[PDB]
Design an enzyme around this catalytic site. Structure first.
Site, short mmCIF file in Angstrom:
data_model
loop_
_atom_site.label_atom_id
_atom_site.label_comp_id
_atom_site.label_asym_id
_atom_site.label_seq_id
_atom_site.Cartn_x
_atom_site.Cartn_y
_atom_site.Cartn_z
CG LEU A 40 -9.75 4.84 7.33
CD1 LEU A 40 -10.42 6.20 7.41
CD2 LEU A 40 -9.54 4.44 5.88
CG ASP A 41 -3.06 4.63 6.78
OD1 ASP A 41 -3.85 5.46 6.29
OD2 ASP A 41 -2.16 4.07 6.12
CB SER A 42 -0.96 8.52 9.41
OG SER A 42 -0.16 7.86 8.44
CG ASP A 44 -6.15 5.15 3.59
OD1 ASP A 44 -5.78 5.63 2.49
OD2 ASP A 44 -6.27 3.92 3.78
#
Ligand code: LMN
Ligand code: PC1
Ligand code: 3PE
Ligand code: 3PE
Ligand code: 3PE
Ligand code: 3PE
Ligand code: 3PE
Ligand code: ZMP
Lengths: 85, 37, 98, 38, 74, 494, 77, 60, 340, 73, 170, 80
Positions: A40-42, A44
């Site tokens: 994932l990321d910041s 998501d």
């Protein structure tokens, strides 16, 4: 009689598998981090809590929505709130 | 418990069957066709 | 600062789209459109622009605020909240004469 | 809109034999319609 | 499931019992007792109100009219 | 010997007994309270016997005693329909006031008990004397025992409270005294029978009205002259706070039935618009402020100002319904007000040490019985039916309305505003949260003593509200003598 | 025949229905009493009373065919 | 205007079911056999079907 | 309050002024209520607003000096409105005490008895023909026009919008709760047919089951009334010359009686009009939700439609002006007296 | 006198109560205040009293039939 | 029968409310609901009695307020409006009482709940059976007190507290 | 579950989940008390229920079997 450890894990496990953006369904565990372990990321990860809150019918305050960054913290944070149904 | 389904259908069946029955007799009167007498 | 607040307004934005559009089919299209807006301005660096950019979208959240947002029944403002609150002090009174 | 276009009355005021004089309270109370102006 | 009723009436715990302070005898046997005894005695106090006196006369005054057919035709 | 003198001398025997047992026998302070309690109940017994021999349709004063020993000042006692229920209420309240302060008075118990027994004799003499100079002698005689009671057993601002009550009462009374003196000069006496058949000049009646009304306006109290009540009802001990709000306030209501209506008929009729202006202003102002009062005691105390205005307007109605409802209101008020002071000044204050409504919340969770009685007591203060407060409120409002419609209309906003502050205070203390978080120490509910004095008070206000004929029956014939007017075809019959 | 007031005050019919046709109202109100007002019992003579309601109504709507033209189709209400 | 690239018309233009989303696999359960457009209205008028047959029998 | 005016009818019949205010208080109230109930997001709020629209229909009828119809409607409304509240009550109990429409849908397969009784109650409320509520409320509308006056015809129009928006909220409650797509979480719907669980198959299902005997028995009893009770008792209250209230209980003066003209003078179209407007406005409400369903979203974000959504959701802003101009002003007046 | 229960005495709440108790010492005759005091002590009672004067004896309902009037003045 | 319709719901509430410790939960429900079912039965009978026969009935128990011209009685008159109005009130109250056995079966304070709706029942009968406006006002004031006490049944919720002040003051 | 509550609080309505062990025995006692005075209310009503109309003999009217003001009328009319 309340929420149990086995109940929350299997419910949450079927949820983040709903992304088309994670690395793989086999890469999620109890201690799986939202960034380092699974993909994932910041932006998501905040959608995950905004789906977790929907599927436990609770409200996640902004102050407590930032410490939650791994599956394990999600499991224990649910158990701390008795309002979860 | 299938008993709940039967009462639901029964009430709906009893309701609707009443409207057709209450329209077979009283229906012409309120449409301006036949006065009661 | 300038990072937590941006993420908070993302949730507020998705929350307000569902609050106005009840149908989960249709908010999904809306929610996907919102994520594009957050992704488009990802690389903004100057703090002067960042503060101004955050301020503007707070008005957008205000300009289309719902007359009453959804609130789970146990949440503060929900229907079941503070309903059968237990007593704070379960211990018996100390022996006093009145 | 209603004031400009609202239908006139369909039936004449019902005639009452004797204007219901005695049984509406006598001359000391209001009576019914009997051969009055329309 | 249901719980048995519980609580300490007057704040007396199940181990102990209520202790008289000194006002109980005078209040119950004196003030309340007198008020009850007064109540039964009030049931025998003769009627002295102006209405029941005036109802009697007014009954006669309306009797000497078309109202209130009197028992005797005099 | 008359039973009316038996009423006055019994509390003096208790004073003698209390002050003398120490010599007769380190006596336990519990015995004095038993002597003081037994004395007040014996007094109630004589009052109940007097009421059972009382005649509800006699115009002559009853239970009088021949004197034939005429001095300059003599004490003549009598009782008629108007004064008997005020006598019964003093006798019913005094035992409850002593039992209310049974554990709270910790020092100077002889002093506290002797002043209360003296106050019972002095307060009863007010409703029993048959002379207007005698009336003033006992109306103002309560000032020294009340001054000492507040300063000896009062709260932090007791010195200011004890100075306010004495000075306002002394000042208003000196205006009443100047009027009573002018009447004695004109008639030669103030004995009721002689003075009642006096017809003063109208201009004299006007200057007699003022001064008498100046006095009663300070002791009603009307708004703008009510600073003494809030200081003295709050700072006074619970027992003295009960006597001040249940009996002391009702001396001026009874004083209108002896000093204004039967001897100042024209002035009362002409100056009714002043009284109704003050009364309606009092109802509104006394209601908005008690919405904002944060002292629970000051809030119950100042609602009395709002109810005192209602039966003050009903006593100027010149209507048999308004006059009777005014007595019923002043009688019912002395029940509910007594109970509310017990609930606030006795039950909350003794447990918390504070009177601030900020610290109280959700006491229903811990005190089921307190919320039960405190809710019926707030319903009575709001004038809900099945309560004698409703009947007095309803009847004196009809008389006020029938006398001056617009003043009765403005006065009839107390149905809204009295309920506005009685339920607002209830929902902040009993309800409105789980339990106040400033209570680090769980409370106990009502004790048996707290339960009985409250249960007795709500009993009187409810039985008399379901059957107000118990009071109304003996009140009808004598108030017929205080109305002023005639009919065009029912007067001067030949 | 028309029902005179003497047997029509005794019948206790409502004031607003004290008119010519009320001779058929008295028997109608007896079925309602006798049959507990059930709307399937004396539909026969209920129709008769409702029929006489219509005729008197028609005589009261035709009476403005000369009254309305007298006012030139104005607002008679 | 609107330094942030939010336009209401394009917000409204993006009000549909998206061709691709990161979330169908969790959201698809709502539009299924239990909650199909047909099975959801299969019993919108519960007793209507049986009454129609019964009414026809009474008429004949 | 409706009983008070019916009881006081012998007194108020002798003043047409209070009957004219009766006729316009109810007409304003029945439309003031229907316009608000459409925009409420709580189910109990919609049923409360529906209660005040039918109460306005009772008050409007009293203004027509037809106290028999008001009694008939006060009685018929009682039976079906309770069923709506009690049927809704089983919906809130089935879900985790949720009361927001935004979290319901698809519950028809989960609450078959609840949906059926709430559908019966909804048709009686909308006055679907030949149902208990039909005989009562629809006759007030005919009586309103039957009184051939400006006010009567005016409030027939005023009440015919109220009929339209009643159908719209009726659809909203019935559709969003049972007939719509699931808007709530898995927990409300996750049946035990699918496994979805490895070692916790005993619990965690709780898929919004129906009620028990004590919960459903009143719903079945109240359903009978909403289908048949109005027809059985229509002669007692309405009739044409019935003598039920001949103890001077409900007093009507010959001067302004409109019963005979209502059954004879009203054109056939006006008598049957509310039925036409109900079918037409109910299919559109179904068509604008799960059939077209964008137009509502377009409207809720149109600048004009945004404000009137919030104007009616916020209850004509009446409570907002009550607090800051009445109760706060009363609170500030007290502050002036205590402090100054 | 007798000891009470232990109360979490809030310093802010106990100083608000002391200020409210002591507030009377700090009142001054200022421009706004005289208007407030004049309005509620004089004007409002005067208006209420004047209307009572002008409506005293004006109306009576006692047994007024059709043909009489509520007004008597 | 015509005074037992009035009084019977009052007895259920008193026992359920002041001796609910002694009757328990299911006993309080059994008493309150039976007092309403039985009162319903009689009010159905009283409909046939009064309405279908046109025989109103008057009961004067004793006088409430006697003051010169005004004589207010504790008295009850059943007429066609009274028995008609008592049908929905008693039938719906019976069903809601039954509905509550399974609806409030989780709430702890369950004796107080059943005592309040049985107290509301009493007041609504008092209102419609009165001889005069003032005895009607006892039921009118009492229905407001019962509605207040039930809107603030969950009195630890501030929202229920504000909604009950609004109900009682409006 | 079940809300925790103090065991030291005495309520007349029972408390939190208050069901006594003798609930049935006491419900029986209270039900007899309710019936006992309801009959007394029934006795008083039957004597003071006043009517101005007499029900027809052929009509369902259970009041006829206890209320005195028409019970005597039936036997008084049974004299010819
Ligand atoms: C901060 C303001 C204080 C104002 C004080 C004013 C005091 C005025 C005198 C007080 C008073 C009563 C005192 C009662 C006690 C309360 C006193 C008031 C309490 C406070 C409100 C004295 O009363 C004595 O007055 C004697 C006569 O002097 C009479 O003998 C008796 O009336 C009585 O003994 C009033 O009596 C009055 O009698 C009348 C004739 O009946 C006198 O004439 C009146 O005035 C004339 C023009 O002056 C005009 O021609 C006319 O209008 C009228 O004929 C008055 O002048 C006054 O005397
Ligand atoms: C009278 C007949 C019915 C009486 C009901 C008694 C209920 C007992 C009760 O509430 O228990 C204490 C209850 C507690 O019962 P509880 O069982 O919930 O107690 C355990 C739980 N705690 C301790 C947390 C509360 O206290 C309250 O809820 C607060 C008291 C307010 C209500 C008191 C009774 C109101 C009814 C009195 C009559 C009002 C009608 C007046 C109408 C005027 C008409 C014109
Ligand atoms: C009636 C009840 C009378 C009563 O109880 O009086 C109480 C008191 C003595 O009772 P008590 O306090 O219980 O004595 C305990 C000694 N261990 O009795 C007294 O002390 C009364 C003393 C009266 C003294 C004067 C008697 C002549 C008058
Ligand atoms: C009526 C006649 C006046 C009566 C006033 C009191 C007379 C009775 C008396 O003398 O009481 C004596 C008492 C002294 O008692 P003592 O020995 O000091 O023991 C208590 C120590 N704290 O001293 C007191 O307690 C008297 C205090 C009461 C004062 C009464 C108020 C008078 C108001 C004027
Ligand atoms: C519990 C039972 C309470 C109801 C008892 C009243 C009753 O059922 O009616 C009695 C009636 C007998 O009277 P009867 O003279 O024999 O009428 C038939 C003549 N062939 O029995 C009958 O057969 C008459 C028909 C039934 C009565 C009419 C019922 C519908 C009227 C509206 C009922 C509203 C209920 C709410
Ligand atoms: C008509 C009309 O013009 O209504 C305007 C008003 C909305 O005003 P608007 O200019 O859109 O405010 C924008 C603020 N951002 O729209 C409104 O809010 C009016 C609210 C009251 C609606 C009354 C019922 C509708 C009346 C028109 C049909
Ligand atoms: C609750 C209702 C209480 C009903 C019990 C009393 C009713 C019994 C009827 C009766 O005959 O006694 C009524 C009694 C006096 O009745 P009364 O109107 O004064 O008739 C005599 C007129 N000369 O009046 C009374 O009994 C007084 C009622 C007491 C009210 C408080 C206790 C309840
Ligand atoms: P991850 O993506 O979480 O990383 C976030 C980072 C650290 C990149 C920050 O976002 C960041 O530093 N970005 C650049 C500077 C900044 O702070 N930007 C914040 C985002 S600006 C933005 O997203 C603008 C659009 C906001 C939304 C507009 C619409 C709002 C909703 C309207 C609803 C109307 C009713 C339905």
């Amino acid at each position: 009689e309340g929420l149990q450890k086995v109940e929350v894990y299997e419910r949450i496990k079927s949820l983040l598998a709903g992304f088309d953006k994670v690395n793989d369904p086999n890469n999620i565990t109890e201690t799986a981090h939202f960034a380092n372990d699974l993909g994932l990321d910041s932006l998501d990860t905040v959608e995950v809590v905004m789906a977790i809150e929907e599927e436990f019918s609770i409200e996640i305050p902004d102050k407590d929505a930032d410490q939650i960054h791994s599956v394990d913290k999600a499991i224990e944070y649910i158990l701390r709130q008795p309002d979860a149904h | 418990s299938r008993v709940h389904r039967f009462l639901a259908t029964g009430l709906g069946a009893s309701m609707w069957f009443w409207i057709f029955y209450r329209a077979k007799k009283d229906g012409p009167v309120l449409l301006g066709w036949k006065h009661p007498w | 600062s300038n990072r937590q607040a941006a993420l908070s307004l993302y949730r507020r934005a998705l929350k307000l789209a569902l609050d106005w559009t009840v149908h989960r089919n249709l908010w999904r299209g809306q929610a996907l459109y919102i994520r594009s807006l957050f992704e488009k301005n990802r690389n903004v660096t100057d703090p002067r622009l960042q503060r101004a950019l955050l301020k503007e979208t707070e008005k957008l959240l205000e300009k289309w605020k719902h007359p009453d947002p959804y609130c789970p029944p146990t949440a503060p403002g929900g229907s079941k909240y503070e309903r059968n609150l237990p007593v704070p002090n379960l211990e018996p009174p100390p022996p006093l004469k009145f | 809109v209603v004031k400009l276009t609202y239908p006139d009355r369909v039936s004449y005021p019902r005639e009452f034999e004797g204007g219901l004089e005695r049984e509406l309270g006598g001359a000391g109370a209001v009576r019914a319609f009997l051969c009055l102006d329309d | 499931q249901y719980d048995p009723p519980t609580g300490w009436l007057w704040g007396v715990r199940p181990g102990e019992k209520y202790q008289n302070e000194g006002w109980e005898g005078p209040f119950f046997y004196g003030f309340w007792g007198s008020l009850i005894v007064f109540a039964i005695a009030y049931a025998y106090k003769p009627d002295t109100s102006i209405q029941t006196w005036a109802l009697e006369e007014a009954r006669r005054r309306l009797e000497a009219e078309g109202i209130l057919e009197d028992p005797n035709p005099t | 010997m008359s039973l009316l003198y038996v009423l006055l001398i019994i509390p003096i025997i208790g004073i003698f007994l209390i002050s003398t047992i120490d010599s007769f026998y380190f006596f336990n302070v519990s015995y004095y309270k038993k002597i003081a309690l037994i004395t007040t109940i014996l007094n109630l017994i004589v009052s109940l016997i007097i009421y059972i021999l009382f005649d509800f349709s006699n115009n002559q004063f009853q239970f009088i005693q021949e004197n034939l020993d005429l001095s300059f000042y003599d004490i003549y006692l009598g009782v008629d329909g108007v004064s008997i229920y005020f006598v019964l209420l003093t006798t019913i309240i005094m035992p409850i006031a002593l039992v209310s302060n049974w554990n709270s008075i910790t020092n100077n118990i002889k002093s506290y008990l002797i002043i209360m027994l003296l106050l019972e004799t002095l307060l009863l003499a007010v409703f029993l004397v048959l002379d207007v100079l005698l009336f003033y002698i006992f109306f103002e005689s309560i000032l020294p025992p009340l001054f000492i009671l507040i300063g000896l057993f009062g709260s932090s601002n007791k010195v200011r409270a004890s100075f306010y009550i004495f000075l306002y009462t002394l000042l208003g009374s000196l205006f009443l005294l100047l009027s009573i003196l002018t009447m004695s000069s004109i008639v030669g006496t103030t004995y009721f029978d002689v003075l009642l058949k006096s017809s003063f000049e109208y201009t004299t009646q006007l200057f007699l009205f003022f001064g008498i009304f100046i006095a009663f306006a300070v002791k009603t109290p009307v708004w703008g002259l009510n600073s003494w009540l809030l200081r003295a009802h709050v700072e006074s001990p619970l027992g003295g706070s009960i006597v001040l709000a249940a009996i002391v306030l009702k001396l001026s209501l009874y004083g209108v039935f002896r000093l204004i209506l039967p001897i100042l008929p024209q002035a009362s009729l002409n100056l009714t618009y002043i009284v109704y202006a003050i009364g309606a202003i009092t109802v509104l102002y006394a209601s908005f402020s008690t919405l904002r009062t944060v002292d629970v005691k000051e809030l119950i105390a100042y609602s009395s100002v709002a109810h005192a205005a209602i039966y003050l307007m009903g006593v100027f109605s010149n209507t048999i319904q308004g006059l009777e409802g005014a007595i019923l209101l002043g009688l019912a008020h002395g029940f509910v007000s007594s109970g509310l002071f017990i609930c606030a000044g006795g039950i909350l204050y003794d447990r918390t040490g504070t009177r601030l409504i900020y610290f109280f919340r959700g006491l229903t969770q811990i005190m089921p019985l307190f919320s039960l009685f405190f809710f019926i007591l707030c319903l009575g203060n709001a004038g809900t039916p099945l309560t004698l407060n409703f009947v007095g409120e309803f009847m004196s409002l009809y008389g006020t309305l029938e006398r001056l419609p617009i003043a009765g209309m403005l006065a009839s906003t107390s149905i809204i505003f009295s309920a506005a502050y009685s339920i607002y205070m209830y929902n902040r203390i009993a309800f409105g949260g789980s339990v106040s978080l400033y209570f680090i120490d769980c409370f106990r509910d009502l004790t048996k003593r707290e339960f009985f004095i409250l249960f007795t008070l709500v009993s009187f206000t409810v039985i008399l509200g379901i059957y107000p004929s118990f009071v109304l029956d003996g009140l009808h014939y004598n108030i017929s003598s205080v109305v002023y007017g005639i009919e065009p075809n029912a007067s001067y019959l030949t | 025949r028309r029902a005179t007031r003497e047997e029509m005050r005794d019948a206790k019919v409502p004031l607003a229905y004290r008119d010519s046709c009320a001779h058929l109202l008295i028997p109608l109100n007896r079925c309602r009493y006798e049959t507990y007002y059930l709307p399937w019992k004396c539909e026969d003579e209920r129709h008769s009373y409702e029929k006489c309601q219509y005729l008197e109504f028609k005589k009261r709507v035709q009476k403005m065919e000369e009254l309305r033209e007298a006012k030139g189709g104005a607002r008679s209400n | 205007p609107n330094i942030t690239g939010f336009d209401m018309r394009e917000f409204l233009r993006h009000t549909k079911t998206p061709t691709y989303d990161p979330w169908e696999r969790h959201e698809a359960w709502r539009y299924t056999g239990r909650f199909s457009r047909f099975n959801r209205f299969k019993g919108a008028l519960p007793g209507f079907g049986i009454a129609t047959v019964a009414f026809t029998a009474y008429c004949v | 309050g409706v009983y008070l005016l019916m009881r006081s009818s012998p007194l108020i019949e002798y003043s047409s002024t209070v009957l004219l205010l009766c006729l316009w208080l109810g007409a304003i109230t029945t439309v003031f209520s229907s316009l608000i109930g459409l925009f409420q997001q709580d189910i109990k709020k919609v049923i409360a607003y529906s209660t005040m629209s039918q109460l306005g229909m009772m008050v409007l009828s009293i203004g027509l000096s037809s106290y028999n119809i008001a009694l008939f409607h006060l009685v018929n409304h009682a039976f079906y409105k309770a069923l709506l509240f009690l049927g809704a009550g089983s919906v809130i109990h089935a879900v985790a005490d949720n009361q927001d429409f935004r979290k319901f849908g698809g519950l028809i397969s989960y609450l078959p008895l609840t949906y059926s009784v709430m559908l019966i109650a909804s048709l009686s409320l909308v006055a679907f023909p030949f149902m208990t509520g039909f005989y009562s409320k629809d006759f007030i509308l005919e009586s309103a026009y039957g009184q051939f006056s400006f006010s009567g015809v005016a409030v027939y129009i005023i009440a015919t919008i109220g009929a339209i928006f009643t159908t719209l909220y009726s659809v909203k409650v019935l559709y969003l709760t049972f007939l719509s797509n699931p808007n709530g979480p898995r927990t409300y719907y996750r049946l035990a047919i699918d496994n979805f669980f490895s070692a916790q198959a005993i619990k965690s299902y709780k898929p919004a089951h129906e009620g028990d005997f004590f919960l459903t028995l009143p719903l079945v009893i109240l359903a009978l009334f909403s289908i048949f009770f109005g027809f059985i008792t229509k002669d007692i209250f309405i009739g044409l010359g019935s003598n039920f209230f001949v103890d001077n209980s409900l007093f009507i003066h010959p001067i302004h009686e409109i019963m005979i003209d209502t059954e004879f003078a009203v054109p056939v179209l006006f008598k049957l009009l509310p039925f036409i407007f109900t079918i037409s406005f109910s299919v559109i409400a179904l068509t604008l939700s799960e059939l077209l369903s964008e137009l509502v979203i377009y409207f809720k974000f149109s600048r004009f439609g945004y404000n009137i959504f919030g104007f009616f959701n916020q209850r004509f802003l009446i409570e907002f002006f009550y607090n800051k101009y009445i109760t706060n002003l009363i609170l500030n007046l007290g502050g002036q007296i205590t402090k100054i | 006198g007798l000891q009470h229960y232990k109360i979490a005495m809030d310093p802010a709440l106990v100083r608000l109560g002391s200020m409210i108790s002591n507030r009377y010492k700090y009142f001054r005759w200022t421009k706004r205040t005289a208007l407030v005091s004049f309005m509620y002590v004089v004007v409002v009672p005067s208006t209420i009293g004047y209307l009572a004067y002008k409506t005293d004896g004006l109306w009576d309902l006692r047994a007024k039939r059709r043909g009489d009037l509520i007004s008597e003045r | 029968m015509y005074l037992s319709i009035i009084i019977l719901p009052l007895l259920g509430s008193v026992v359920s409310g002041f001796f609910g410790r002694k009757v328990g939960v299911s006993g309080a429900q059994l008493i309150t609901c039976s007092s309403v079912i039985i009162t319903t039965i009689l009010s159905i009978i009283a409909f046939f009695e009064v309405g279908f026969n046109n025989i109103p009935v008057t009961i004067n128990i004793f006088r409430w307020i006697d003051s010169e011209w005004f004589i207010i009685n504790w008295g009850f008159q059943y007429d066609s409006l009274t028995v008609s109005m008592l049908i929905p009130v008693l039938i719906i109250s019976s069903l809601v009482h039954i509905y509550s056995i399974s609806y409030m079966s989780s709430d702890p304070h369950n004796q107080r709940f059943f005592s309040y709706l049985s107290l509301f029942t009493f007041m609504m009968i008092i209102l419609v059976t009165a001889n005069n406006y003032l005895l009607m006002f006892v039921g009118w004031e009492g229905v407001g007190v019962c509605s207040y006490l039930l809107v603030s049944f969950w009195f630890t919720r501030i929202a229920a507290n504000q909604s009950s002040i609004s109900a009682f003051l409006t | 579950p079940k809300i925790p509550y103090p065991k030291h609080v005495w309520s007349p309505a029972g408390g939190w989940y208050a069901q006594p062990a003798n609930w049935k025995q006491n419900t029986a006692i209270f039900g007899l008390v309710i019936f006992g005075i309801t009959a007394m209310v029934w006795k008083y009503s039957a004597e003071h229920e006043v009517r101005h109309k007499m029900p027809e003999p052929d009509r369902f009217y259970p009041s006829r079997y206890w209320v005195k003001q028409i019970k005597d009328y039936e036997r008084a009319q049974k004299e010819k």
